[PDB]
């Protein structure tokens, strides 16, 4: 039995109406469970048997089902509501989950702010070289870097990390590492990250000349 | 209060065998089901293991059948898994939980690998010298080259928490993990304030403070 979820991510404000469903591939009766899960804590269970609120989970928490739907509403969102939620199926063994839905908060558009790091001498002794380009505190997530090496686009030799949303501004940054190796690096002069982002004009470069302090 | 502990995680070899064990408190499990789950490194939520353990009855996931066996102590009222063969597969967050599955303990990490451990080394990420005078600049550390997760980073020793984002890992081609931790402050405290990151890899031992200077 396998249980359907969408979708798989949305954003939202706080007083919105959220709906999040629930598709099991056979009949599973009553026998669901929604859980709330957030980064590197314990899943917590809100609605037991497809429509009963768990004691201490507050009221604007509600599930219903019609047939094999099963849906998760939440009435009226308040923010600590911001997380992950999966749906369960414990009709039969095993139980199974759905693959999850992240809620995530709405904002205002905002642009990044645009850093560019030179690999420090330390790491260039020891033997490597990682170029670095920073955004920082942007909306939406959706972002674009590109590389440029003497004005030459660079393709396949870069890798990003993202934070998840900041728990006071509701933004995202993003770190990018060009790699080299030290031979390659020294091989050329002007270094530069591009941005495109919704929150800008027109991207944006940032760039420095190998060597200069 | 009820509560469930798992421990027993850690970093073991393809193949091998590791115990968890899951301390209940604040209810006895004589009086429902202990259950394991786990969750890779994105991959959803899994179901692995069940036990009743006032009769000692057990279920199990197919991908896990025989070579793992889940198992109770009443009198100490806690379970276990005893994991064998494992498998890179297995690689996840063990989280055990009771019967809906109404309480869940933090998990515990297991990482199969044939890797060694391996401590970090730490570089400045250096504020730029074109920094915007009055404004705001960047300044951070590389945290490169170590294995298994986790690292930590702070910085100043915790004083300085205001605009830090410590990224994610990134895994690298090489296998070991890096990462980057970043912070904006003012340009006016480039010259009079000092900036060290603190650095944390349990895994290997490895405690390491890098001052950050322009």
């Known amino acids: 039995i396998q249980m359907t979820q969408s979708p798989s991510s949305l954003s939202a404000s706080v007083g919105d109406r959220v709906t999040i469903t629930c598709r099991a591939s056979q009949d599973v009766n009553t026998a669901v469970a929604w859980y709330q899960e957030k980064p590197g804590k314990a899943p917590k269970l809100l609605i037991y048997?497809?429509?009963f609120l768990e004691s201490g989970v507050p009221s604007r928490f509600s599930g219903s089902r019609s047939g094999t739907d099963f849906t998760l509403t939440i009435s009226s969102l308040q923010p600590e509501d911001f997380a992950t939620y999966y749906c369960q199926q414990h009709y039969t063994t095993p139980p199974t989950f759905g693959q999850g839905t992240k809620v995530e908060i709405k904002r205002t558009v905002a642009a990044p702010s645009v850093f560019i790091f030179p690999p420090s001498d330390e790491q260039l002794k020891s033997g490597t070289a990682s170029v670095k380009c920073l955004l920082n505190n942007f909306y939406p997530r959706e972002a674009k870097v590109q590389w440029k090496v003497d004005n030459a686009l660079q393709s396949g030799n870069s890798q990003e990390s993202v934070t998840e949303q900041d728990s006071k501004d509701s933004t995202y940054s993003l770190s990018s590492t060009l790699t080299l190796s030290k031979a390659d690096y020294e091989k050329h002069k002007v270094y530069a990250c591009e941005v495109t982002h919704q929150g800008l004009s027109s991207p944006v470069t940032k760039s420095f000349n190998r060597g200069e302090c | 209060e009820v509560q469930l502990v798992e421990s027993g995680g850690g970093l073991v070899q393809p193949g091998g065998s590791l115990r968890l064990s899951c301390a209940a408190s604040?209810?006895?499990?004589?009086?429902?089901?202990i259950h394991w789950v786990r969750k890779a490194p994105g991959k959803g939520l899994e179901w692995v293991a069940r036990?009743?353990?006032?009769?000692?009855?057990?279920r199990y996931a197919d991908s896990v059948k025989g070579r793992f066996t889940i198992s109770a102590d009443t009198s100490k009222n806690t379970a276990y898994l005893q994991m064998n063969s494992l498998r890179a597969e297995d690689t996840a967050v063990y989280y055990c939980s009771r019967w809906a599955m109404d309480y869940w303990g933090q998990g515990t990490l297991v990482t199969v690998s044939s890797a060694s451990t391996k401590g970090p080394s730490v570089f400045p990420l250096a504020p730029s010298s074109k920094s915007t005078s009055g404004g705001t600049a960047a300044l951070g550390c590389l945290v490169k080259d170590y294995f298994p997760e986790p690292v930590t980073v702070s910085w100043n020793s915790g004083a300085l928490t205001s605009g830090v984002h410590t990224f994610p890992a990134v895994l690298q081609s090489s296998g070991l993990y890096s990462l980057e931790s970043v912070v904006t402050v003012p340009s006016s405290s480039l010259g009079t304030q000092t900036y060290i990151c603190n650095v944390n890899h349990k895994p290997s031992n490895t405690k390491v403070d890098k001052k950050v200077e322009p």
């Open positions: 048997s497809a429509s």
């Open positions: 036990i009743y353990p006032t009769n000692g009855y057990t």
């Open positions: 604040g209810f006895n499990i004589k009086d429902t089901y």
